Design a protein around this ligand. Structure first.
Ligand SMILES: Nc1nc2c(ncn2[C@@H]2O[C@H](COP(=O)(O)OP(=O)(O)NP(=O)(O)O)[C@@H](O)[C@H]2O)c(=O)[nH]1
Ligand SMILES: [Mg+2]
Length: 168
């Protein structure tokens, strides 16, 4: 059983914790309880293999930015999450990707672009915008809803596959 060190990143309130708690506990956290940092562990089957997911749920609040360097060193793949109704969180992705490449000293780091809250009406970030960003970064782009569970498994399983190829 291969362990995978996933890190969920993104601006405050985009749904990083809700996506994680949905994946591992199958329930939707309705209240906004801002994260500092929490670790989770979930065993799954992806492409006929048993793997353990080591998931770090990080803080979007800028006040805790001093924790980023340490978790970008140890993590192996990054779920970069924005909310489809938060233009700033989409723009923040550039800044996360840059800091990750800096700390990894590499232009090829496993990551997946996640546009969350797709259950909502009147998104301010259209799909075409996010596709072009992800294509330019050379990473997958998956639309999710932590509330309905749409795309949650797909987002985490795709990141596992990205880490799988980088190691091999
Ligand atoms: N409608 C909708 N609401 C969502 C979705 N995901 C999260 N939310 C809601 O948005 C709020 C923030 O979610 P949360 O997961 O705590 O965000 P976070 O990115 O972990 N915030 P922090 O960086 O402060 O921990 C909560 O009220 C939550 O219920 C989603 O897919 N759809
Ligand atoms: Mg959180």
């Amino acid at each position: 059983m291969t362990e995978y060190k996933l890190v969920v990143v993104g601006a405050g309130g985009v749904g990083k914790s809700a996506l994680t708690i949905q994946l591992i506990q199958n329930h939707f956290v309705d209240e906004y309880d801002p994260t500092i940092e929490d670790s989770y562990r979930k065993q799954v089957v992806i492409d006929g293999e048993t793997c353990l997911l080591d998931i770090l749920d990080t803080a979007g609040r800028e006040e805790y930015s001093a924790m980023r360097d340490q978790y970008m060193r140890t993590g192996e793949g990054f779920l970069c999450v924005f909310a489809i109704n938060n233009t700033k969180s989409f723009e923040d992705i550039h800044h996360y990707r840059e800091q990750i490449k800096r700390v990894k000293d590499s232009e090829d780091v496993p990551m997946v672009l996640v546009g969350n809250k797709c259950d909502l009406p009147s998104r301010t970030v259209d799909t075409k915008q996010a596709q072009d960003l992800a294509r330019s970064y050379g990473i997958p782009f998956i639309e999710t809803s932590a509330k309905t569970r749409q795309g949650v498994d797909d987002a985490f399983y795709t990141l596992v596959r990205e880490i799988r190829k980088h190691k091999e």
